[PDB]
Structure 1
Amino acid sequence: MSAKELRCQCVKTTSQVRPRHITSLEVIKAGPHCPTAQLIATLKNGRKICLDLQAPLYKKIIKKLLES
């Protein structure tokens, strides 16, 4: 009914990183081990941080991808 916690280190949001030289990002919804919305990303230096979906921060990312 209302699962909580399980296997998602991307809890809350890793917005500590800033959007700009991004390359690609994944977006998984709240699955089983992840009852919360989970979004991970990837930079130009093939590494992956993670952002949220209910914030204008990642909207600057997708918006930066629509620009082209």
Structure 2
Amino acid sequence: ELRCVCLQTTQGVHPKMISNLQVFAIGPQCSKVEVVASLKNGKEICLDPEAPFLKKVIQKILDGG
């Protein structure tokens, strides 16, 4: 059975530590959008989709240069 990937969520992480952002959109797997952040440490976190932090992080990552 398919299940959501993020049980609890975090809103605070330093952008400089982020390596990957994987976004799962609304679908059969889950009823809510969910963003997974994979860090340079090798760990994984579940960010808050609705927080202002995510948008700024994405904008920064797409404008490295």
Does TM-score exceed 0.5, indicating one fold?
yes
Name the count of aligned residue pairs: 63
Q: Distance in 2 between matches of 1:29 and 1:52?
A: 13
CA RMSD in angstroms, aligned pairs only? 2.1
1:3 aligns with none
User: Structure 1 or 2: larger strand share?
Assistant: 2
1:54 aligns with 50
Question: Structure 1 vs Structure 2: percent identity of aligned residues?
Answer: 48
> Is there any run of 5+ residues in structure 1 with no aligned partner, and where?
1-5
> Is there any run of 5+ residues in structure 2 with no aligned partner, and where?
none
Find runs of 4+ consecutive structure 1 residues off by over 4 angstroms. Answer: none
CA-CA distance at 1:20 after TM superposition: 2.7
- Tell me the secondary structure at the aligned position of residue 31 of structure 2: coil
Does the CA-based 8 Å contact 2:25-2:33 persist in structure 1?
yes
Counterpart pick for 2:23 among 22, 27, 34: 27
